[PDB]
Amino acid sequence: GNKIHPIGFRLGITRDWESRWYAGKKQYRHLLLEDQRIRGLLEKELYSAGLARVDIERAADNVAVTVHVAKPGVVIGRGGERIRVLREELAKLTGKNVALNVQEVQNPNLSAPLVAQRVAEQIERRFAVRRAIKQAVQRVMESGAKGAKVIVSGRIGGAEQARTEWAAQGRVPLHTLRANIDYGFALARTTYGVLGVKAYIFLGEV
Amino acid sequence: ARKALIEKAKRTPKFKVRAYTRCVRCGRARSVYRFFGLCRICLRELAHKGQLPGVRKASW
Amino acid sequence: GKGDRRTRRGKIWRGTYGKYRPRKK
Amino acid sequence: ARRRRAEVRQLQPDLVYGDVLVTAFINKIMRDGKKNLAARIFYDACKIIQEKTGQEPLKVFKQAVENVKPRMEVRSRRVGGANYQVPMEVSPRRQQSLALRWLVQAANQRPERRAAVRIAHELMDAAEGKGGAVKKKEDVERMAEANRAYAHYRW
Amino acid sequence: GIKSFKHKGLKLLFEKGVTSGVPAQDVDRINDRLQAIDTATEIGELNRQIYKLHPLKGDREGYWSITVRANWRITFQFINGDAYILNYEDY
Amino acid sequence: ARIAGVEIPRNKRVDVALTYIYGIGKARAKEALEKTGINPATRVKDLTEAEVVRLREYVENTWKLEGELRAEVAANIKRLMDIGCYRGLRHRRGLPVRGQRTRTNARTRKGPRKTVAG
RNA sequence: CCGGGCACUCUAACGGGACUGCCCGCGAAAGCGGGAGGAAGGAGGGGACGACGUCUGGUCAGCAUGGCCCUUACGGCCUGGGCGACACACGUGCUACAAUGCCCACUACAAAGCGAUGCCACCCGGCAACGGGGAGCUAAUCGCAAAAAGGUGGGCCCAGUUCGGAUUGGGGUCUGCAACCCGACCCCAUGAAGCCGGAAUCGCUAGUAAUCGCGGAUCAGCCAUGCCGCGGUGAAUACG
RNA sequence: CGCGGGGUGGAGCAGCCUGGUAGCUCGUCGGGCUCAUAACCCGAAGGUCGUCGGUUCAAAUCCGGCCCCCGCAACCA
RNA sequence: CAAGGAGGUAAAAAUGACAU
Numbered sequence A: 001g002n003k004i005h006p007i008g009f010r011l012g013i014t015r016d017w018e019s020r021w022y023a024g025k026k027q028y029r030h031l032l033l034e035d036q037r038i039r040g041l042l043e044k045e046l047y048s049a050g051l052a053r054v055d056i057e058r059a060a061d062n063v064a065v066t067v068h069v070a071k072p073g074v075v076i077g078r079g080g081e082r083i084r085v086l087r088e089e090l091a092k093l094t095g096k097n098v099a100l101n102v103q104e105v106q107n108p109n110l111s112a113p114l115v116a117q118r119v120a121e122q123i124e125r126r127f128a129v130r131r132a133i134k135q136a137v138q139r140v141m142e143s144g145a146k147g148a149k150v151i152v153s154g155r156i157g158g159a160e161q162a163r164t165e166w167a168a169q170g171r172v173p174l175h176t177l178r179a180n181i182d183y184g185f186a187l188a189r190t191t192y193g194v195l196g197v198k199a200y201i202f203l204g205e206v
Numbered sequence B: 001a002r003k004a005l006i007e008k009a010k011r012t013p014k015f016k017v018r019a020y021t022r023c024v025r026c027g028r029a030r031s032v033y034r035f036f037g038l039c040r041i042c043l044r045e046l047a048h049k050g051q052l053p054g055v056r057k058a059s060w
Numbered sequence C: 001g002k003g004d005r006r007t008r009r010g011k012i013w014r015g016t017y018g019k020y021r022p023r024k025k
Numbered sequence D: 001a002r003r004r005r006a007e008v009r010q011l012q013p014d015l016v017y018g019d020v021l022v023t024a025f026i027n028k029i030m031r032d033g034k035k036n037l038a039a040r041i042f043y044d045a046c047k048i049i050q051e052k053t054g055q056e057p058l059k060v061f062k063q064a065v066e067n068v069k070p071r072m073e074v075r076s077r078r079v080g081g082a083n084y085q086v087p088m089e090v091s092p093r094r095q096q097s098l099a100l101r102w103l104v105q106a107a108n109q110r111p112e113r114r115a116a117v118r119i120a121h122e123l124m125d126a127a128e129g130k131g132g133a134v135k136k137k138e139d140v141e142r143m144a145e146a147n148r149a150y151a152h153y154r155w
Numbered sequence E: 001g002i003k004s005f006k007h008k009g010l011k012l013l014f015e016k017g018v019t020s021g022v023p024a025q026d027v028d029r030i031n032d033r034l035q036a037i038d039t040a041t042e043i044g045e046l047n048r049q050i051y052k053l054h055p056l057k058g059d060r061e062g063y064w065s066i067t068v069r070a071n072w073r074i075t076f077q078f079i080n081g082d083a084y085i086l087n088y089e090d091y
Numbered sequence F: 001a002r003i004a005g006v007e008i009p010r011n012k013r014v015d016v017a018l019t020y021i022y023g024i025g026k027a028r029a030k031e032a033l034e035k036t037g038i039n040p041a042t043r044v045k046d047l048t049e050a051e052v053v054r055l056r057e058y059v060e061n062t063w064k065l066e067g068e069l070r071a072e073v074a075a076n077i078k079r080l081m082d083i084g085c086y087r088g089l090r091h092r093r094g095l096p097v098r099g100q101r102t103r104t105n106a107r108t109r110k111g112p113r114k115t116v117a118g
Numbered sequence G: 001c002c003g004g005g006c007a008c009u010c011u012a013a014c015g016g017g018a019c020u021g022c023c024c025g026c027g028a029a030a031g032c033g034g035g036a037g038g039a040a041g042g043a044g045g046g047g048a049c050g051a052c053g054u055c056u057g058g059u060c061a062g063c064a065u066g067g068c069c070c071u072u073a074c075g076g077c078c079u080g081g082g083c084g085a086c087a088c089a090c091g092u093g094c095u096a097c098a099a100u101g102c103c104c105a106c107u108a109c110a111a112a113g114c115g116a117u118g119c120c121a122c123c124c125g126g127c128a129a130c131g132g133g134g135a136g137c138u139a140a141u142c143g144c145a146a147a148a149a150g151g152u153g154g155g156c157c158c159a160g161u162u163c164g165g166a167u168u169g170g171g172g173u174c175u176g177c178a179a180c181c182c183g184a185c186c187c188c189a190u191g192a193a194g195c196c197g198g199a200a201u202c203g204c205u206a207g208u209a210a211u212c213g214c215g216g217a218u219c220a221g222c223c224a225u226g227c228c229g230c231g232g233u234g235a236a237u238a239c240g
Numbered sequence H: 001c002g003c004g005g006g007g008u009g010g011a012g013c014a015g016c017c018u019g020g021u022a023g024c025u026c027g028u029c030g031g032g033c034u035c036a037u038a039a040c041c042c043g044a045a046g047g048u049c050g051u052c053g054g055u056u057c058a059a060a061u062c063c064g065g066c067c068c069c070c071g072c073a074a075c076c077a
Numbered sequence I: 001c002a003a004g005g006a007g008g009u010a011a012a013a014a015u016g017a018c019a020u
Ligand SMILES: [Mg+2]
Pocket: B020, B021, B022, B029, B030, B031, B032
């Protein structure tokens, strides 16, 4: 097969970055490690929110962090916890301006990371994968999508024989640059191994 | 020898020449770029992710 | 004689300088 | 499968002469892409022609090429695991190329010491019809001569 | 008598009893086979049904191949009461 | 002119003719004729006998050369005879002295290939 | 270099620019051939981009991970050794066998990149590697760098030779806690094989092949002749 | 045991008579070709001449003694 | 213009591989 990451393939035109800060040497290395440890720490105790993105911006001790979520149900009104020390526990190895925002991803059926994550949950629920793929695609296609494509590969339904389940409706042109194609991926942990879920969501451009 | 080996890579005492680079995301000792502090493998992963500020595909 | 260490040409190829190739002027 | 008939490459005319031929000769002299040393050698040899003979090198060189031109050459062709050698005619393009190539090669075959004197002499010998290249030309025509049997296979 | 190894794991299992070069469940299996190839005074002794013995073809001519388990083979050259180049390899 | 142990080089530049002695090379060559004060580009063909005498007297003395220093060099290798080091054993086995690659190459000390086959 | 100016060159940011749109001819169309049109053309030249799938391909030694096994040890620390071993065989290369060549001196002309826990101008010691000083540079400012092939002058004169540089002795330098096993340079002396390659076998169709030097990554140093890039000069031929 | 012939690289054969050179095919070893094996192509190595003595400056060779191998002969009673 | 019915046919080149 061999195909390039549809995110990296854009980056410049279509699909901007995810960590937008500028530094020269002697700083880039340290600030990138911290940046990645933020992404690592957030992903853990915020998965129940199901986060589509983790945007990060900086400006000398400013560190802004925008968490996109389908349902920000785990924020609960100011002093109702789930934010207070939670956005303050970041500065236990940072000590800088931990400005943590929360975004409301409107339609989760149009967010590739969320789609793949919903599918990967279902694999671990011991669902029928082929039927799960079909539904998720139509579900994405039901919410106004111009094209969709989900891919689960390896060890399907347990059973000693790595497979690859494939389904895709509408239009998904990966080669085109003016594409606006959202890509998501998820690890499904099973008692019989590990399988990967790709999810492609496409909308118009020009 | 992998866990106790990514220990030494950060421990760095006893003679200055015994200290060496080591990917942080992984534990790779080879092809470790000083600029990112990452191996060539990890660097490619994150560059496609978009989590590498400014880092962009090279076409010319 | 790109491999002879006693020529301006071999000293180029090797990179290093010396008596058979002074550091200019 | 040569869909395009590969158009004939055209050159830049030289200095002082304007030849549409001499530059092609200088090119064959050229090794490693040093046209400076190549052109110099030819013009050097041109100065050498003036000495041993009171002739303008533009004709001495011209006639030499004309004398080292293969009228017909031998071509290995079809049927029998490519067993035959049909003697074919030579295109003006190919006579051109062979003349200059054989000249330079025969020129560097000579026992002389300087590249210029080899070129000059081989040209003077070839202008007369004596050069080692003329040997090569006459040799290639012998082969083409001895194969008139199945020449009617032609093509 | 086994006289030379090509596979390091095989070498260690027979010499020092080092089992960390072979599969853990094939330890006893590989052992009984190696001892058989060691005691064998002729290729005819390495002929028990459970070995599926046969000489290889092509560039591997001169070699033999008894079956350990599944697609796994112990290949060697038997000559004058001795086996040489004991290898453990894919089928 | 029988300068040191040799005489051979005739009509061929004294700075070059000198080279034809085990002990002279190229640096000691011009160094010897600038210190003796003789024109390097001379004929070597038995020129001014005086220049030849001075040259001979300086060159043949000063530093060790020819058969004498060959003996010293061979004796420096004989140093690692006795119960010598590792470097001696490399002179013993006939293998390269400076620890290089011997898996291939090293033909200049090993000699031409012998081919075992098996 | 200053005054001053920024039209040239350049720098980098958006644009304009051909779409065979226009002419002749062919055709039913698509299109093809040819011609002024211009820097450019009938996808202008190169990149990035790799369908459904195939190879039980590769990869548990980057990483994640099912299963098996090891736990005073198949884990952990250390000093030393080893990955560098050599009677041999193959691959990818580098350097050559020379005179369109070698050496020495002088003198020009690039691009693309890298550096203030470094690049290190200019002096001073030193045959030199390099050491002492020490200015400028968070760098289209200062430095790495003089590009090299080229040109001019001079010398060798075709002989294993001023070709060729292996191998080995001796003397040194630099990094490093330390370079015996195994570091790179420098200087003196040695100067080997090779005089152009059997059967076979490879690359490249225009800035191309060939040839010439330059930069970077990793990097204390370096076994780099490798890899990824940069430009200099610049062929031959394609009937089929 | 009576005559004749014969022992030479791994195999099969020359060379001996006209003493000073041991050569041929196959095989073996290296390298190619092929995905690979064969075929094929290039290039190598390899022989106390059965053995013990003698003659000779010199012995595979010429002369004796044994030692095997093969072939003829062994008739008249 | 447009073809049917007739006839001389490549070479020298063998083999198959390791659980269904
Ligand atoms: Mg490292």
